[PDB]
Design a binder for this molecule. Structure first.
Ligand SMILES: CCCCCCCCCCCCCCCCCC(=O)OC[C@H](COP(=O)([O-])OCC(O)COP(=O)([O-])OC[C@@H](COC(=O)CCCCCCCCCCCCCCCCC)OC(=O)CCCCCCCCCCCCCCCCC)OC(=O)CCCCCCCCCCCCCCCCC
Ligand SMILES: CCCCCCCCCCCCCCCCCC(=O)OC[C@H](COP(=O)([O-])OCC(O)COP(=O)([O-])OC[C@@H](COC(=O)CCCCCCCCCCCCCCCCC)OC(=O)CCCCCCCCCCCCCCCCC)OC(=O)CCCCCCCCCCCCCCCCC
Ligand SMILES: CCCCCCCCCCCCCCCCCC(=O)OC[C@H](COP(=O)(O)OCCN)OC(=O)CCCCCCCCCCCCCCCCC
Ligand SMILES: CCCCCCCCCCCCCCCCCC(=O)OC[C@H](COP(=O)(O)OCCN)OC(=O)CCCCCCCCCCCCCCCCC
Ligand SMILES: CCCCCCCCCCCC(=O)OC[C@H](COP(=O)(O)OCC[N+](C)(C)C)OC(=O)CCCCCCCCCCC
Ligand code: SF4
Ligand code: SF4
Lengths: 68, 61, 61, 191, 341, 123, 388, 164, 94
């Protein structure tokens, strides 16, 4: 949606630690349920909100700072 | 009308506005018929191509 | 035969808009000119009223 | 009915082909002051700018690639891989059909009789700098050994890391087997 | 003279930082108009992109072609930045809250916008090759042809107020902004402003030369950076001319009844809140017009040099030499010639 | 109409050796007059006389060709190359293809008798 | 005496959709002579095809144009079927049609919206390329690849459509007219677009025919030629559509034709989605088309045929043919020759951008450089095609 | 009341069911027989009309070919461009082909089109590495580039060409 | 030392052919610039020259509009193309 209410509600949903982590990694704020974690430690989420267009429902949160 | 439009918004499969924002859009739009163009997530590309049930029943035509 | 083939629906699909949908909008132009000259004339009134008062304040000074 | 001389009823012109005429300034059903206002206040220009602005308030299409990937299909053709049976044995038998149909002649094979009396490979190479990613090689194989993964993230700093050999392909297939099983379970019936 | 140093450094910091983030604002505004985003990865939402483009260009080689001049390609961007910056001195952010506070401020800006052309003139002489010297000529003819049209508007409004002090011109706009009686001049001034900066839809030479092997600004290193802090500042400056000439400058809602209700005395708080309100009106106006430079860029296609010189000397100038006759007549009809104060 | 470029000659197959003699001589003359241009346009590291020497060598190559049609073909190809060179179409590499000799001696052993070729398996 | 000034437009040109060394000769601003140089991207396709089977060579014809792949391979499929004397099944015809029009959309988008960007309007480009990127998902679903694909093969189609594709096509189709209209708003009625496109690149009927020009360049002069009507090939005879035509032969008329072709192609896509017959998508003769795998792994003759088609290939009868299509650029064509072998003896791709660039000298004489840009943009040459 | 949130989910809509697909077996060449008889008559007219030049003609599936010699190119092209029944005004292609087994190894091929009558036609000559061919740039300006191609690709020399 | 005086020092120290419209545009920019600059004294003395110097500057501007009229109707600034499109008619002697 690119609206401010989205980021504000998301930052209320997921706490400030995850906010600064998302800001330092993705560049966006995103909140959604966990689906699981792989063998390298990378966590994978999914969203249901209407605001999120196609191809932005599922996202990753890498473990290493040097993500690839 | 003709066999080629125009067609309203509630038949186009795009993500639109809801509530007072729709009234405002239909006010401030050159053509309120027009769509944002973002597809509707529940429908577009669902079920995913790697999970289509129809592949188990498929047989060479 | 055919079993699992991607096939159309029985009632077909609802028609799409393929014709031009650029609806002419706006008032007729002379209204936009009449608002233009009216805004201008109101601004000339308000300004030339502000010049005559500056003239008198200068007479005082 | 009609007899034609160096012509036909198709090449006869359309009934209304002759365009009527250009209109002049007279026979203009739009007064001079109206089109003057549209000339001096730049109407269609403001309209185009407003159609631009409405996009300013709409959802952008962009996705963040390393954290959100774009759509991928089972039919997709990326990196190569050599598969195995559930038994742990490899599927390649050196039929050398992949070596023959390949347009770019990237593949290079050399077989011989294995110690157990079977047909197997000692060399299987792919020059991914020759590959065009056509998928004819996953189509010819009658055992579904060679495949093309959806992986596309295999760039390198050197051109000699792209001359894949058998060991680099067998490990790539050991790695991506779960993804290959998904794509195969939803692509094989059509293939 | 300490606070004079403080006041200079404040101004320079505010203007240069505004220029740096006008680059980012140009890119993000233009992006969202194009249904994309970004720069939003080089900072906390892209607020460090401009300093990254800078620092990359300052650690970049200073490479000079064989058959080129060195001194001309070096000083000419530098002199362009200087001339573009000194026009900021006469620009007010409050009634007398100006560094210059000259009584000839209009004429100072008008003489400095005449000195600006020399950057484009000396660029073509940085290339001894023959086609660049004609491409610079195209780009000079647009500027000197459009400066006649910007000036003519300065004179048309000064018929209303007979003073070259910028603050006085703004204080006469308490009664009404001069964009209401002379609304068409708002379009004309904004068109000509976009032209003088060689901005789209008037970017003929940079495009016509981007195809060719030369005839553009093929600089590198620091001179790139100065030319891109001199384009994005001449933009604000020409937007400011629009502001203090037609849009009331720093003026806003009368804050008489509010300040009466809330303060009771002239303290060093009321002066601050006043200067905040004034500058904020001046700033939001500059923002809307910088948005408009971008808005125009996103939409309209390009002009050709024939269409452009024809636009100027055959359509705009006649309307203005007409307006030169209608306005003095309009004052003479009603006995409303302004006084010298 | 699609008009011809600068130094274009229309292809015309002469029926006699006596006319092609003249046309070839004009081509040789043009190459020689234009050699300094071939030295300026292409950043050349040798003499104008050496260019004229190579031109004389290239014309001595086919000096003993008596079949008329082959001579007409050779003349047309040479005019093509003159048009390619004088208009700045060729770059330096495609021009110095004709001057291998000027480049530095490629190594030491350049076999010319049998035994060296045998030791290098070139016989 | 007018002495000229030779300039290179540049082999390193941001504007051109490819690499072109254009040598112009100017007397001030006016162009008087033009010598388009090419071969900077000529890969040598027509020779290599002679060493490859008729199947191995299909990928060549997709790399001859950066866009417009599925039509470019639809020409080779038709030539080789005409030689083999086989008939495509109906479902394969309708698919080849639908993807031909999806491809014409994908080409006209790039073409019109590169003309814009070379003329300065950066925005319609990026408003259209998203539509291209939704339409390429359909490509990756049917073929696996995003651009160069190889779906259409001699004897029909490689693999059938996956389930749930016509639905998504219908969705995109219901929403596409709006975005085309948003492009028309900026470009069509605008003044500057007309100033840059009205009485430019003007070419007459007789000249357009003498120069070999086809497609919109010809339909802008007033001649109604469309191979899809005058010589229907796949299913363009079993589906309704109209052919726009224009007077004045300028760039503006060609732009209007291209937008009209967008909308008529949308009409065709809707129709084909509403009637996709069942059946096979490829010829049922396993001597030409590889069989299914559930037979190749259970029946002997099918495995033999698989082996031979994927080693030696199929033997085309001796003969020769030029067959052509209405490719979005123009009238594309292939001149194949056969000698009774699985390898072609000759294959000349007739490339409409070739004749377009060849006419460029006749078309640009008298015009200034911005108009030369607009002219190359009317033709929107794809220089990989121009260089063959 | 209606909105995109209440839009019909077409994915569930009932889909056509076909039990047996019926595709008749047919030769694709029975479609062409009458056009082929017509092309034979037309070629016969042209051979009777220009006996000095036309050596032969072939026909194969709605494609005609006329065999000539290099001298006969300009005349026959004039006939095929200017005659009323054969207004072949457009030049589609030029192509050479190498048949080394022949004395004259090359075989230049012109393709032509008539938007008027909606027809194509071919025209073949022969050449060698040294025997040139007349250029039809006198008539069709588009032949300029195609003849430059055929020269560069195969070596054939097109006499009269302004800039080969 | 004034802040203007501090600032106005600190900033600096920390073969071919052409069409004659290319040259006329510059050559004509001079007189029109001198006109618009000579109009400055009027706008700054407009009150003191009440209704006399008004009429004087109008005759000034009208005289200058004459020269502008001469420029337009000559079409000086227009670019002229040499490779004209043929508009003769095709006539065959019989
Ligand atoms: C200093 C920097 C601070 C910047 C942050 C500002 C954030 C903020 O103030 O939010 C205000 C907030 C913005 O609305 P929003 O919550 O983000 O909209 C989300 C809806 O879901 C929106 O629903 P939608 O997706 O369908 O969009 C509807 C849209 C449709 O907009 C239009 O179509 C109108 C076209 C533009 C008209 C331009 C006239 C100027 O209208 C708007 O959103 C408001 C545009 C103004 O509330 C206001 O509407 C105030 C408007 C001022
Ligand atoms: C920012 C908002 C952007 C709006 C975007 C939507 C849009 O395109 O607005 C067009 C919209 C008209 O579009 P429409 O839906 O097709 O209405 C057609 C009229 O009913 C057509 O009615 P009509 O032309 O036949 O005559 C109706 C006329 C009655 O005619 C008379 O009695 C003569 C009036 C003499 C004055 O009504 C008036 O006189 C209203 C007074 C207008 C004066 C202010 C003009 C500014 O114009 C507006 O009302 C919006 C504000 C003005 C234009 C946009 C902002 C300034 C430019
Ligand atoms: C930024 C704000 C942008 C507002 C966008 C609305 C633009 C209105 C427009 O499209 O032009 C309207 C035009 C009338 O157009 P027309 O078709 O000729 O009139 C008959 C209509 N029944 O009206 C005109 O001709 C006059 C142009 C008015 C421009 C308004 C200035 C802003
Ligand atoms: C927010 C900012 C929005 C504004 C952004 C504008 C971006 C730049 C606009 C580019 C100019 C458009 C253009 O292309 O101009 C050239 C065009 C040429 O037309 P022309 O050669 O004269 O052909 C005549 C036969 N029709 O001729 C034109 O179109 C010029 C049209 C006039 C230009 C604007 C004039 C504004 C001044 C209005 C004065 C009103 C008084 C005059 C009388 C009006 C009567 C109602
Ligand atoms: C300067 C402080 C510093 O030392 O930098 C600290 C950070 C790192 O910078 P960054 O990596 O480029 O931004 C992160 C971009 N993530 C992508 C990667 O600065 C910033 O993010 C922005 C500083 C505040 C902006 C002030 C306006 C996700
Ligand atoms: S898919 Fe790749 S590896 Fe396989 S044959 Fe084609 S180019 Fe070669
Ligand atoms: S086709 Fe399959 S089995 Fe045969 S050689 Fe290739 S990979 Fe091995």
């Amino acid at each position: 949606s690119s609206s401010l209410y989205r980021v504000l509600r998301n930052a209320w949903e997921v706490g400030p630690r995850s906010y600064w982590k998302q800001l330092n990694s993705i560049g966006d704020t995103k909140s959604g349920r966990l689906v699981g974690t792989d063998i390298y430690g990378n966590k994978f989420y999914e969203t249901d909100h209407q605001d999120e267009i196609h191809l932005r429902t599922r996202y990753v949160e890498y473990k290493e700072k040097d993500y690839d | 009308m003709l066999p080629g439009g125009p067609v309203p918004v509630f038949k186009k499969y795009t993500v639109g506005s809801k509530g007072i924002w729709e009234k405002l859009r239909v006010l401030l739009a050159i053509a309120p018929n027009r769509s944002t163009g973002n597809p509707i997530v529940p429908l577009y590309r669902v079920p995913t191509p790697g999970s289509r049930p129809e592949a188990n029943v498929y047989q060479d035509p | 035969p055919s079993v699992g083939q991607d096939l159309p629906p029985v009632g077909g699909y609802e028609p799409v808009q393929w014709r031009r949908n650029l609806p002419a909008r706006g008032f007729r132009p002379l209204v936009y000119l009449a608002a233009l000259c009216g805004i201008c004339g109101y601004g000339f009134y308000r300004a030339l009223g502000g010049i005559q008062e500056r003239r008198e304040l200068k007479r005082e000074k | 009915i009609n007899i034609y001389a160096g012509g036909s009823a198709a090449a006869a012109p359309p009934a209304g082909f002759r365009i009527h005429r250009p209109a002049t300034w007279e026979e203009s059903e739009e007064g001079a002051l109206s089109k003057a206002t549209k000339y001096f206040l730049l109407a269609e220009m403001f309209r185009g700018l407003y159609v631009v602005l409405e996009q300013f308030f709409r959802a952008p299409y962009t996705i963040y690639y390393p954290f959100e990937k774009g759509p991928v299909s089972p039919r997709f053709r990326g990196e190569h891989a050599l598969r195995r049976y559930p038994s742990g044995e490899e599927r390649c038998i050196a039929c050398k059909l992949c070596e023959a149909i390949c347009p770019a002649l990237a593949i290079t094979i050399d077989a011989e009789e294995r110690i157990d009396g079977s047909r197997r490979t000692t060399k299987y190479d792919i020059d991914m700098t020759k590959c065009i990613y056509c998928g004819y090689c996953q189509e010819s194989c009658p055992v579904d050994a060679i495949v093309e993964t959806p992986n596309v993230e295999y760039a390198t700093e050197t051109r000699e890391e792209l001359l894949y050999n058998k060991e680099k392909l067998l490990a790539n297939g050991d790695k991506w087997e779960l993804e290959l099983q998904y794509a195969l379970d939803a692509d094989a019936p059509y293939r | 003279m300490i606070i004079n140093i403080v006041e200079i450094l404040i101004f320079l910091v505010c203007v240069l930082f505004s220029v740096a983030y006008l680059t980012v604002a140009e890119r993000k505004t233009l992006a969202y108009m194009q249904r994309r985003l970004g720069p939003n990865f080089v900072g906390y939402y892209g607020l460090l992109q401009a300093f990254a483009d800078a620092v990359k260009l300052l650690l970049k080689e200073i490479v000079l072609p064989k058959e080129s001049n060195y001194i001309i390609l070096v000083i000419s961007p530098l002199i362009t930045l200087i001339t573009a910056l000194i026009g900021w001195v006469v620009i007010p952010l409050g009634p007398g809250i100006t560094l210059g506070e000259l009584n000839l401020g209009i004429l100072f800006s008008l003489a400095i916008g005449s000195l600006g052309v020399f950057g484009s003139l000396l660029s073509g002489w940085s290339s001894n090759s023959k086609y660049s010297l004609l491409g610079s000529i195209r780009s000079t003819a647009q500027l000197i042809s459009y400066e006649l049209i910007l000036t003519s508007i300065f004179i048309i409004i000064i018929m209303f107020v007979s003073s070259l002090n910028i603050t006085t011109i703004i204080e006469t706009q308490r009664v009404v902004w001069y964009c209401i009686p002379l609304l068409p001049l708002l379009l004309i001034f904004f068109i000509a402003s976009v032209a003088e900066t060689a901005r789209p839809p008037f970017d003929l030479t940079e495009s016509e030369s981007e195809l060719v092997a030369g005839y553009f600004t093929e600089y590198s290193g620091s001179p790139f950076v100065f030319f891109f802090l001199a384009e994005y500042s001449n933009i604000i400056l020409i937007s400011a001319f629009n502001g203090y000439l037609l849009l009331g400058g720093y003026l806003s809602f009368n804050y008489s009844y509010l300040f009466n209700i809330l303060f009771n005395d002239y303290s060093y708080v009321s002066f601050l809140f006043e200067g905040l309100i004034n500058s904020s009106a001046y700033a939001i106006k500059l923002v809307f017009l910088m948005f408009s430079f971008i808005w125009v860029r996103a939409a309209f296609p390009r002009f050709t040099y024939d269409n452009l010189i024809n636009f100027c000397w055959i359509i705009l100038l006649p309307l203005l030499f007409g307006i030169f006759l209608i306005i003095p007549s309009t004052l003479y009809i009603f006995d409303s010639f302004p006084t010298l104060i | 109409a699609i008009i011809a470029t600068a130094f274009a000659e229309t292809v015309k197959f002469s029926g006699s050796k006596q006319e092609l003699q003249k046309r070839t001589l004009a081509l040789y003359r043009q190459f020689l007059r234009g050699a300094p241009t071939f030295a300026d346009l292409y950043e050349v590291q040798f003499s104008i006389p050496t260019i004229r020497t190579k031109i004389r060598q290239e014309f001595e190559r086919h000096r003993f060709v008596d079949d008329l049609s082959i001579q007409n073909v050779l003349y047309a190809k040479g005019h093509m190359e003159y048009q390619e060179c004088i208009n700045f179409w060729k770059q330096q590499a495609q021009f110095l293809k004709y001057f291998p000799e000027e480049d530095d001696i490629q190594g030491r052993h350049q076999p010319s008798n049998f035994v060296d070729k045998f030791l290098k398996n070139r016989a | 005496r007018i002495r000229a000034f030779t300039i290179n437009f540049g082999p390193q040109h941001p504007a051109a959709h490819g690499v072109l060394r254009l040598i112009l000769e100017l007397s001030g601003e006016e162009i008087i002579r033009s010598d388009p140089h090419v071969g900077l991207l000529h890969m040598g396709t027509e020779k290599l095809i002679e060493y490859k089977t008729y199947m191995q060579a299909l990928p060549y014809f997709d790399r001859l144009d950066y866009v417009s792949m599925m039509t470019n391979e639809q020409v080779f499929s038709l030539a080789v079927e005409k030689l083999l004397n086989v008939e495509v099944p109906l479902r394969g015809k309708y698919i080849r049609t639908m993807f031909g029009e999806i491809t014409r959309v994908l080409n006209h988008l790039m073409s019109v919206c590169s003309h814009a960007m070379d003329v300065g309007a950066l925005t319609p480009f990026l408003w259209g390329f998203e539509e291209r990127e939704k339409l390429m998902e359909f490509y990756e679903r049917v073929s696996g690849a995003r651009l160069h694909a190889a779906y259409v093969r001699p004897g029909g189609v490689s693999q059938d459509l996956p389930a749930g594709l016509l639905d998504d096509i219908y969705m995109w189709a219901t929403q596409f007219g709006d975005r085309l209209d948003e492009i028309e708003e900026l470009l069509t009625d605008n003044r500057i677009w007309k100033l840059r496109t009205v009485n430019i690149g003007t070419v007459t009927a007789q000249d357009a025919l003498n120069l070999g020009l086809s497609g919109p360049m010809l339909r802008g002069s007033g001649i109604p030629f469309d191979i899809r009507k005058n010589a229907p090939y796949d299913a363009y005879d079993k589906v309704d559509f109209d052919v726009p035509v224009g007077m004045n032969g300028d760039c503006y008329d060609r732009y209007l034709i291209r937008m009209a072709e967008f909308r008529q192609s949308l009409r065709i896509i809707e129709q084909c989605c509403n009637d996709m017959p069942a059946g096979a998508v490829k010829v049922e003769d396993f001597k030409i088309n590889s069989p299914p795998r559930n037979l190749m792994k259970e029946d002997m003759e099918a495995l033999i045929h698989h082996f031979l088609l994927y080693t030696k290939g199929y033997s085309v009868p001796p003969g020769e043919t030029y067959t052509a299509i209405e490719a979005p650029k123009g009238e594309m064509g292939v001149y194949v020759v056969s000698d009774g072998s699985e390898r072609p003896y000759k294959c000349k791709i007739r490339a409409p951008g070739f004749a377009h660039l060849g006419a460029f000298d006749h078309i640009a004489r008298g015009h200034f450089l911005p108009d030369a840009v607009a002219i190359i943009g009317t033709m929107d040459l794809v220089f990989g095609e121009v260089d063959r | 009341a209606p909105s995109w949130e209440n839009i019909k989910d077409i994915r569930l809509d009932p889909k056509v069911h076909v039990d047996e697909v019926y595709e008749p077996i047919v030769n694709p060449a029975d479609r062409y027989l009458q056009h082929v008889s017509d092309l034979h008559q037309y070629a016969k007219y042209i051979m009777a009309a220009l006996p000095k030049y036309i050596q032969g003609f072939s026909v194969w599936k709605d494609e005609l070919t006329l065999h000539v010699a290099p001298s006969a190119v300009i005349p026959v092209t004039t006939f095929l461009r200017d005659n009323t029944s054969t207004q072949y005004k457009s030049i589609i292609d030029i192509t050479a082909v190498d048949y080394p087994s022949r004395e004259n190894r090359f075989e230049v091929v012109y393709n032509f089109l008539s938007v008027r009558h909606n027809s194509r036609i071919r025209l073949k000559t022969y050449a060698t590495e040294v025997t040139p061919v007349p250029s039809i740039t006198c008539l069709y300006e588009g032949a300029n580039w195609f003849e430059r191609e055929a020269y560069d690709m195969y070596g054939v020399f097109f006499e009269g060409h302004p800039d080969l | 030392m004034n802040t203007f005086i501090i600032f106005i020092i600190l900033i600096p120290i920390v073969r071919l052919a052409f069409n004659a419209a290319f040259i006329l545009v510059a050559i004509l920019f001079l007189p029109f610039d001198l006109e618009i600059s000579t109009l400055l004294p009027y706008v700054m003395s407009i009150y003191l020259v009440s209704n006399y110097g008004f009429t004087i500057v109008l005759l000034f501007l009208l005289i200058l509009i004459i020269g502008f009229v001469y420029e337009i109707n000559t079409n000086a600034l227009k670019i002229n193309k040499h490779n004209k499109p043929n508009t003769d008619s095709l006539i065959y002697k019989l």
